[PDB]
Amino acid sequence: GNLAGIMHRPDSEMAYVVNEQTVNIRLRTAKDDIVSVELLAGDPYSLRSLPTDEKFYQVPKQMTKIMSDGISDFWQVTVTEPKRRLAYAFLVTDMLGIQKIYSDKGFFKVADADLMDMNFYFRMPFFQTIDQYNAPEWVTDTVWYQIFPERFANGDVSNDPVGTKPWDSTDHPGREDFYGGDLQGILDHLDHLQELGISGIYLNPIFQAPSNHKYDTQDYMTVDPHFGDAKLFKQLVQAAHERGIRVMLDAVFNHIGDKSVQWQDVLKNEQASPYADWFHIHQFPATYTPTDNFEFAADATYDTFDYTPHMPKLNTSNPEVVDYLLNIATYWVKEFDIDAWRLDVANEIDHHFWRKFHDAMMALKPDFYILGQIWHTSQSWLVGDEFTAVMNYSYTGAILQYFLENESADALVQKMSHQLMLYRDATNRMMFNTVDSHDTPRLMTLAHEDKQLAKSILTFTFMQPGVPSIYYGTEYGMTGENDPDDRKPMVWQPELQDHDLYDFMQKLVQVRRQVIAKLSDDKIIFDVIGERQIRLTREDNQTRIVGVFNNGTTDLTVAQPTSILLKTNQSETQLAPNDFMIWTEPVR
Amino acid sequence: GNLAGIMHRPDSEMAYVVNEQTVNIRLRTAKDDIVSVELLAGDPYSLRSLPTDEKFYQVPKQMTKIMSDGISDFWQVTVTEPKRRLAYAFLVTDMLGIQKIYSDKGFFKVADADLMDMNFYFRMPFFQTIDQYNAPEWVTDTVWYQIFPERFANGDVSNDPVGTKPWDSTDHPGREDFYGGDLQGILDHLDHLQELGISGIYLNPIFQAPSNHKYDTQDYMTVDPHFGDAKLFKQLVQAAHERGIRVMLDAVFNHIGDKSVQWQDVLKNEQASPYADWFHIHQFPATYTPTDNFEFAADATYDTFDYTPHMPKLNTSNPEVVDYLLNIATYWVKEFDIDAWRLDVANEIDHHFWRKFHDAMMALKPDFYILGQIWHTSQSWLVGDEFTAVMNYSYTGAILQYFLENESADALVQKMSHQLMLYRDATNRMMFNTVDSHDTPRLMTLAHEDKQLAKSILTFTFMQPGVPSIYYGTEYGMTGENDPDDRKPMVWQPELQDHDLYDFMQKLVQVRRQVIAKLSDDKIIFDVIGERQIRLTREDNQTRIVGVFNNGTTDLTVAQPTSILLKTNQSETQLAPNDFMIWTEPVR
C-alpha cells in the first residue's frame, strides 16, 4: 500500500488521444506493490444527466501491467467513448488486499468516494485530435544511413579545400583536416546504399561554413561550394527518391558561425549593427580572449554553443530571427523536397519557436519528420506540437553498456522500460536509434574489434521499437575513437572492408524491413531468462518475432525454432556466449 | 528509502524559469521518508570545458521541505546561473541514513554516479523567458465581486423582458424567471462596490441571448438589449476604471446558442450550410427528441454542452471558427478596454486555440488576465502560454468541507498543500477563490445561517495565496440553494440586509488589500495546532500575518498579540468554538 508510489498525471503521456473516440491511459505504481488496477471511466455528464439507473463506475475496465523499471510498475488501458468526454479514476488493490480509489481528489475507500460527482474524477475533457500526437507512417518502414559528407566519398577533386589529404580510411584525422568528400560522391554511391537496403539518408550539415563539420554556419541558403551547388543537391534528392530513399538534413539553428554576414556585421558595427539583437551579447564590443584551443574561450562577452567563441548563440525569441529561420526551413523543403529535418542542439531553443516550426513544416508536408538532437529526457518536446522524435541516446547507451560491460539483464530491461514509459506509444516508434555517430566512438572500437559482439548490439537495437540508423562505414567494420577519430574517410578499398559484416548487415536490414516493420500494431515484451540472458518478443495477433541473446559465460539451450530468421551459431538449439538467434512463429 | 515515492519531472512545475538567470526546482518524496535533499547543479558544459579543478557537483545547494500532502513531501530550491544553462541532480538521504543520487538516469550510489558526464543530469537546457509563466501584478491587489446581471439591479424598467417579476430578494426564482437586472443597475450601484472595497467586477455573460443567464449566445458582438447597448457598456467600464475597479467579462466559446444566426442556418440548410463545420454534427438533419426538461435531450445528433440541445458545441479546430472567436475576443478588449476574460467550460476547448487566444490577448494588453472555468486539476493550461489562472474550485471546496463538516485539520492542510504543489508559485497567487457562485449553493445556506461560521470561511479563504472574489449579496447574508435558487434578486432593502456582516466584509477586504496583498514575496505556512485548530502564517522578511482558527468544540487560549487585525471574540487571548483571530507581528 505504497500510496506515495502511485501517480497519474492527467493530460500527459499517461492520458492522451489516439483517435477521435479513443484514449490511452496509464498509471504508475510501486514495483510489485499493487496486484490489480481497474479503471472507472465514462462521460462525466452521464452520471447526473442521463435518466438511466446505470452509471459508468459500475462497469470497471481492467488495466494491464505492461512494464516495470525496477522502481515502478506501469499499467495501461485503452478507452473508447462516443461522447468524446471522459472522467476516470483508478481502483488499486495492494498485496494485502487493501483496495482504494485514486482520483483527482486523492485516495479514498470506495464507500467514501463521491462517485456521482463528475468533479471527483480525473478528466480528459473533450478528445481533441488537433492537440494529439501524430506519427508519420513512412518512418516505420525506414532504415537510415548517416553520412558525414566531408568523409563519405570524393566525387569531384576540383571542389576540394586547399590542403586536402589523400583519401585514406586508415588515417587518424586531425580536427582541421579535409579529405574532399562532397555531394557528387554521395550520388556516385547510391547503389551501395540501395544494395545495403537503407531507405533514408541523414546528412550532417551541408550549408556553406568554413569547417570540415559545417556546424559553424556561414550561409544557410547555399550549399557549401566544396560540397556542391543547388542543382547538384536537387539531383541528389531526386536520385535518392527514385530509389525509395528519403532525405533528412541537419538544421543548425541554435547558433551561427562567426564568419556569417550577421556576426561579421556585429563585429564591424557593434551595438549599431541591425543584427545585435539576433544574438545574446552581454557587453560590446563582442569579444573574447583566444586560447590555445580554437574551440574554447573562458570570457566571451556573448552566449555561445558550449564555450566556443566561433558559435554565437542565436536569439530565437527575436521575431526577425524567427522569420529568418522559418524561411530557411521552408526553402529547403519547398525547393528541394527534403523529407525531414534533424535539429541540432534542439533543447537549447525555446518551445515557442519549435511550435511555429512544427506548424510551418506540417502546413507544407503533413507527413514531415522532425527529429531533435537531445541527449536527455525529452517529454516536453514530444507532446505532438513540436518534434516527432528525438535521438534516442539514453536507450542505445543503455544497450551498449549492457553488451560491453557486466551488468545484469535486469538492469538493462529496467532502463529500456523506463524509457518507453516516458513517452506516448506512437512516439516510441519514431525515436531514432543509432549506436554511434560523428560525436561518439565507433561501434567496432567500443567492441574492441569483437565482431560477434558488434553484431549482437546491432541486432538487439534493430529489434527495438524505434527506427534504426547505421553510421557510414559501420557495415564494413570501421574503427575510430571519439571526434575527430570517428570521422575517418570511408573505406572503399575491398581489401580493407569486412565483407562478412556487410553481408550480415544486409540480412539484418532485411529482417527489420520485411518482418519487424510489417507487424500490425505489435507489442514488445522483455524477459530476463537467466544471468545475462534476454528474450525479446515483438508480437501482433498473427505473428511473433522472438530473439534470444546469450551474453553470459555459459552455453544456453533453447527449443529448436521452426522458422529461424537470423542467428550466429551454426546450431539451431545452442547459443554459445555472445550468440543470438531470431525466429518467427505463429501466435497460438 | 521509498524510491518509488521520489519523482522529479523536468520542464514542468518542478523545474521552471522565474527570470533570465533564475529557476525554481522541486522534488517529490514519500512523506517523512527522506530526511534531507541537496541539489547538485551548474552549467552542463562547465564539467569538461572549463580548465578549473572545481566542479559544480562539489558545492551542493540545500533544498527545503516546503509542504506535505499526507502522502508526499515537496522540496524546493531557487538556483541562479549566469550561463543560463543548468544540469542538476538530487542527493537524497532516507531515515536510516541511506544516501543516493537521483538524476535523469535514475538512482545511484554517489561513488557509482557519472558526475563528469553532463548527460547524467536532469536538464534546464537554456533559460527561456519567452516560454516562462508570467503573473500580471495588478491581480495581486484585487478583490473581485461577481455580478449575475439579470439579478443585481434594475436600472431601467423600459428594457425589461416580457413577464418580468417585481424585484423581491425573498423570492425563490424559477429557472425561466426575469427580474429585469441590467447594466444601468450596475452603474447605479458602483458606490456600493467602492464602499465595500472591491477592485474588480466579474460579470456573467452580457451578450445577446434568449435566457436569463445568457450562456446560450445568440450574438457575441452585441450587448443583450435587455441589458443595455454598446454606449452604456463603455460608460460602465469607464466609470468602473475611474473608481479603480477592473472589469472581467465571461467568454462562452465552447458552445453557441441554438438561436444564433449560425445554428439557425444549419437548421435551414443542413449540410449545405456554410456553418455546418463550425459544429460537431454527426447526422443531418441536426435534430433531437424533446423531453419534459428543456435542458435535456438523449439523442441529439450533434455534440452539445452537457446534454442540452440548445447549446451546440463549437468546432474550435476549424480556422473560420478560430478567426471568428479571436475577432470577438479582440473587439471587446480593443473597443471597451476590458481587463480580463473568464473562459466558460474552458477545459473542453483545445490547447491550440487557447495558445492563439493567449497570444492575441497579450499582444493587445501585456498585463491581460485570462481565467479558465475548470473544476478539476488544470496543470496543462497553466504553463504560461494559455491561461493565467483557473477558478480554484477544489481549493475552496476543501475549505468549505472542513468548516462545514468534522474532518481533521490535517486533512484540510493536506488538500491545500497538494493543490499548491500542482502549480508554479506565481500561478498559485493568480488562482481565483470564490466560496460560492451562480452554480452552487450560497455560503449562508451552506452554513445553515451560522454567521460566525460564514465569517470564518470567508476569512480563512481571504488569507490564502489566490485572489478572492465575493458573489453578489454575500456581503448582506443572502441565502439560496443551488441554481436557480442561488440567483435571487439582490437585497437592496436595508431592513432585509445583514449590516453586521457588511461591516465585517469591509474590514476583511481592508485586511486583504492593505496588509496581505502588500507583503513582499511572502510565503505561507500551515500549522495544525490541535484537534480542528489551525494556525495560518504568511510572512516576508519584515512582517508576519498570523491567523488562528478554532473549529473544535473546546476553548483555545493563545498568547495576547500586540497588534490584532481582526477577531470575532471580545477576548484578546481566548477563542471559543468557531472563533478566529488575525494579527500582525515583526519578524524577529
Ligand SMILES: OC[C@H]1O[C@H](O[C@H]2[C@H](O)[C@@H](O)[C@@H](O)O[C@@H]2CO)[C@H](O)[C@@H](O)[C@@H]1O
Ligand atoms: O566546434 C564545436 C563542435 O561543433 C560540432 O559539434 C556539434 C555536434 O557534432 C552536434 O552533433 C551537436 O552536438 O552540436 C555541436 C555543435 O553544433 C562539431 O561536430 C565538433 O567537431 C566541434 O567540436
Ligand SMILES: OC[C@H]1O[C@H](O[C@H]2[C@H](O)[C@@H](O)[C@@H](O)O[C@@H]2CO)[C@H](O)[C@@H](O)[C@@H]1O
Ligand atoms: O442550460 C445549461 C446551463 O447553462 C448555464 O450553465 C453554465 C454555467 O452557469 C457556467 O458556470 C459553466 O459551467 O457553463 C454552463 C454552460 O454554459 C446556466 O447558467 C445554467 O443555469 C443552465 O442549466
Ligand SMILES: [Ca+2]
Ligand atoms: Ca571534392
Ligand SMILES: [Ca+2]
Ligand atoms: Ca431592466
